[PDB]
Structure formats: structure tokens, C-alpha cells
Amino acid sequence: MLTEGISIQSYDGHTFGALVGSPAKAPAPVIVIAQDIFGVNAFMRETVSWLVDQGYAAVCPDLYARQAPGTALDPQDERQREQAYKLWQAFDMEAGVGDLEAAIRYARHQPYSNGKVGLVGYSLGGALAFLVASKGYVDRAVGYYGVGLEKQLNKVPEVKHPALFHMGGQDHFVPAPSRQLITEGFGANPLLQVHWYEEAGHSFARTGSSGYVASAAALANERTLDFLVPLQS
Template sequence: MGETTTIKTDDGQFSAYVARPSRSKAPAIVVIQEIFGVNAVMRGVCDELAAAGFLAVCPDLFWRIEPGIDITDQSEAEWKKAFELYNAFDVDAGVKDIAATIDHVRGLPESTGKVGAVGFCLGGLLAFLTATRTDSDASVSFYGVGIEKNLVEADKLGHPLLMHIAEQDQFVPKEAQALIISQLKNHPQIAIHTYPGRDHAFARIGGENYDASDAKLANGRTLAFFKQHLEA
């Protein structure tokens, strides 16, 4: 069971969900939300990372619009609300908030100082930008939306990035996927895995497109990646 903490920035302060591992000192992972806020799915991701030995923190990135968003993907009204939030969201400000979260976590006494990031959907784009714009030690992007519009940012990448791409992603057209892969596949810091037959959010437990087998595969690759780059 996690807890809530407050992260302060020059623009104001926002809350974050924190899940702690059993060990007293651990590397940390910033969990970057989908368009549904810091909800049960994101808290569950944090709890699973904590069980695997990481200090996991999920910041409320919608705080500038409406603090405390916690909705699901189970109703039409919630989807409408989620897309309203998505359309109002300032990506650049969000990355700055992630950077502030990384700085906050890195300075905690229970942190080893190594901090990674993992994001899903909107968070998948933000994880890519976190890898290029912050000092995250290792980042993972799950089915990020809009990455193809930001590929030039890869030139700034200084730390490892792992990407999971759903081949039937309804929000990332085949042309966009092809562009992402062709532009990034030979980058020395980037590893890309594609998942045939999978649609967007195939790793979201309880979601319409959830696939237990490929979710387990992607999550296993993610955990191995973090162990390699954050525990060395």
C-alpha cells in the first residue's frame, strides 16, 4: 500500500503516489500516467515495481488543469473527460514536472540516486521526452502517442531508452510506427520491441485491449532493463 507525497516546483506544487520497496535503499522509477490520471492502474504499476525492489513514484501531471484526476477507461463519460484533459495538457510543462519529480526522488535518503522513468500512452510520449530532455538514467516508453512528431529529439538522448510498440495501435498509424522504427532502430541507446496483433494499451490490466501474455513479456523486458541500468 502506497502513500502520497508533495513535490514543489517554481510553478507550484503537486502530489505524487509513492510505493516503497522492502529494502531501505533502492533505485527509483518515476511512473508516468496515462490520460486517466493517477488511477488504480498507475498505482498498481507502482506497487508492482516496489515489490520488485524499486522506489516507485507517480506524479499528478494533470495538476495544472485539475488536481487529483483518478478515472478509468470503463465508461464513455470517463473517456470524454480523459480526452478533454489530454487536449488541454501542456506537454512541455509536463516534462518539466517529471524532471522536478526526478530531482525530488534522487535526493531522497532512501534513494540510491539512480532514477528511471516508465510511461504509458500519453506517458509513453512523455517517457521518450524524459529520455531526451532530463537526466533520467533509463527510460521506458509503452505505446507512446505522437513520438513520430518528436524524433529529432533523439539527437539529445544520453541514456538508455526501451520502447514497446503495438503493431495494431489505433492511435499510432502504421506510417508513424515505420517512421519511428526506421529513424531510431540504429540508435546506440535505443532498443525497440514490437508486438504483432496488439492494439494500444495492451498492458493495461482490465482494459479492452489487455493481453496477458504480451503484457507479461513487455513488463519482464522492462524490469530486466531497469535492473541492468539502475542497479549497476
């Protein structure tokens, strides 16, 4: 689901919608939420509600608009999960970063904005969060179990603003990254913070997930909120 009427223009004229949550009280920092492989769906709406309930405004852009606008897949339905994997395999990461950049610019300028913008991404969105941190578009970025992070380690020195990443230590559907490689790589730049959840793999934050681990979800969520709170006025 998306907020009817919201249209954000990107770097190449491509336009996409977004699910928007105004803050309980204005002005407030705005959090751009970078979707997982299921599009802007029930869990993304839940994340928008969560951040609003925690004092933020939130914008979840339709990153699947380049392929199939309005895609919102149910992770409990096998055929929709197969469509999610197909969309993910064909997803253009660099265009996703560009769309997120446009969503961040949109977020800085809303009437309810305090001027500060953060980004929180899940899986696909967690990999995107790292790429966005390497470009420096946001004040603070957070990635939950970002897929393929180990392969982007050469970008560690480009990160100029804080970025926090929650890593699942267990393999699940997507394998876990090397604790050794990530720890060493991220360790070189104190703007990067990383936590490992040895009793969880990816997808641990969604209650209905087969990978949900309440303890990991809660501790990661607590750290995400502590990490984002300095953005608040």
C-alpha cells in the same frame, strides 16, 4: 489516489502531489511513473505496487495538477473516459516534462534512494518518457506505446542515456506509428531500443483494457524489468 502530504515543487512554483511507494528494502533505485490520460488511478497504483514487488521504490506524480489536481479517472466509465480525452487534449506537454523533471529530482533525494532513477510511462506518459530521455534527466527511461512518438523523431540524437519503447503494431483507438519511420529513426542511436508487438495496439498492458493482450503485456513487462534491473545495487 495520491499519498497524502506529498508535495513536489516544479520549475515555476507549481506544486503537485504524487503516489509514492517505499521499497521493500533500502537503498533502492526509484522509478518515476509517468501517467496515462486517466491521471493517477488504479492502474497507476498497480504499477507502483508491481515495481515495489520487483525491488524498486516508485513515485507517480499528479501531472494533471496544472488542470485539475487529484484527477483519477476510471477507464471503464464512459463519462470519465470523456473527461480523460478532454484533459489530454488540453495537456501541456512541455510543462509535463518539467513536472516529471522535478519528480525525478525528488526521487533521487529520498531517504530510501540508491541515487539511480528510472522512468516508465504509459501512452501519454510513454510520449513524455521519450521527451524526458531527450533531455537526459534519468538514468533509464521506458515508454509503453507512446502517443505521437513519430512526430518527435528529430530528437533521436539528443538521447544520451538508455530508453526502451514498446510499440503496438496494430491500430486501436490511437493509430499505430509507422514501423518503417520509427525503426529507421531509432536505429541511428544505439541508446534507443524498440520492440514491436504485432498482435497488440496501444493500452495492451492493463488487464481490464479492451486492448489488453496478455502475451504482449508480459513480454513487454519482462523486458522493462530486465532493462531497469541494472539500476539496482
